[PDB]
Write a protein that binds this ligand. Sequence first.
Ligand code: TZG
Ligand code: TZG
Ligand code: CL
Lengths: 254, 255
Amino acid sequence: RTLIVTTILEEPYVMYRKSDKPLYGNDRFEGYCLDLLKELSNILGFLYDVKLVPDGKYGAQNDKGEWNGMVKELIDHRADLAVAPLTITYVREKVIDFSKPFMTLGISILYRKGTPIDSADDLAKQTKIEYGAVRDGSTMTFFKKSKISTYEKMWAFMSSRQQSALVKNSDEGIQRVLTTDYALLMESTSIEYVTQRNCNLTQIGGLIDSKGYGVGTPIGSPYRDKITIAILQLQEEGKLHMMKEKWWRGNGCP
Amino acid sequence: NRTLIVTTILEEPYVMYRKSDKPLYGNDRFEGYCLDLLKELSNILGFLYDVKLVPDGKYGAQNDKGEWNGMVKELIDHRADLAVAPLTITYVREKVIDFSKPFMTLGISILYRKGTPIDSADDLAKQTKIEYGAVRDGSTMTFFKKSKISTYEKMWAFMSSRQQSALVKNSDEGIQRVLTTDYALLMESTSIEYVTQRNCNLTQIGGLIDSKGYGVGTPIGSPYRDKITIAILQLQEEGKLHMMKEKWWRGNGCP
Ligand SMILES: N[C@@H](Cc1cc(Cl)c([N+](=O)[O-])cc1CCC(=O)O)C(=O)O
Ligand SMILES: N[C@@H](Cc1cc(Cl)c([N+](=O)[O-])cc1CCC(=O)O)C(=O)O
Ligand SMILES: [Cl-]
């Protein structure tokens, strides 16, 4: 009856706690998602064991059909819940049962300060500034699948030259923005996070799409609806808003 | 394939009587954002449907005895297969019906006249000269009624005083009350956008007080809920929902 929770290291949602001594079990971790999981477990009355997804991926398909990451963990019933910044997409929703979103966001642009660039359109209609995304997350998958003129055009640039405009993780993307003439396409809530800790960076433009993070469960899970209900309540009570502010504060930038 | 019964409610610009010089029949009677959404869903999922106005003309709330009414009750009692309307996904409602994921996201905000120094809910809550309220026994009102958040608790107490006279019968009345008197209406943000496109002396004050969505309602256990959620997710990603909103919201301009 103790639930297995699959998740992934991603600041500030899930991080190894800083410690002078070895930590064990759930105490090894901290972050927004750990806080959310505590609230959920209290409300619904379950125990849980947090387990990092072994392959270190969120979840995508390969050339012919097979899934990986936390999405596959759910499909195989190697996990009961996935509590991470896991984007609710229709392709994923076809293979797992997502709760309703605990956070809403969209793709936006991370870039250095001091430029005239103001929108995705600006990037798309030029080639002097490089731009790209982290591989195999919902962000790359968005551009790859898009039939929307500008984003289709952006994908062609991004996917060209054996995908040299893409990066392996957000941290590398961030360093690339800091060091070179490069703009990173990134989920807005992570842009918010980073820009309040590094005053040299800023968001460019608004959100190019709209979507949410949801708790994942296997198709047919009896916990999904209960989790949705708890989330809706936590949102209404202002507790999700408080949780976000707790983890996003950072040092602060103008 | 059995034709689905879709309960809904007249609410501009989601669901409206179409303008015709001759009598209209069946689904052709109505138009609006929700009709377009419904047409997309039926094409994608391959179902036929009959649109039926909710007889009691209510969204869905509980009386003193916990009893539901409105489209919520229609779903619980299996008198409709789907509810396609600007129906707010709340935890209280989600307990008794099965909501699809939201086809539109929004929050409570403030509708008020341009030109005032008022900038937030907090500004309203700490004073008593400017009247403020919500649609009586509506979902926005219910948020305040139930809130344990200090500022919103304070607003509800003010709102609820004088046998709920700061509450208005409906949105239309609230709008006219904003236009005629010194009154601010707590209203769902997507409706504020609609109104301010057409009433150039009015504006939204401050940001969203909360965060929520409108979803398609289905009875608990419905086979259609997850299929619809999947269809909505896809329409959203494809940008079709945004186009649909643009279509119905765009006004003639404020020069
Ligand atoms: N939400 C993504 C996973 C993800 C989450 C976060 Cl929180 C960040 N990030 O902190 O910049 C990055 C990514 C992966 C790049 C992406 O797709 O945005 C998914 O569901 O695949
Ligand atoms: N979303 C509300 C129904 C509703 C929808 C709209 Cl679209 C408007 N409106 O145009 O101002 C009003 C209302 C009811 C007043 C309210 O709850 O604010 C519910 O789910 O009960
Ligand atoms: Cl759902």
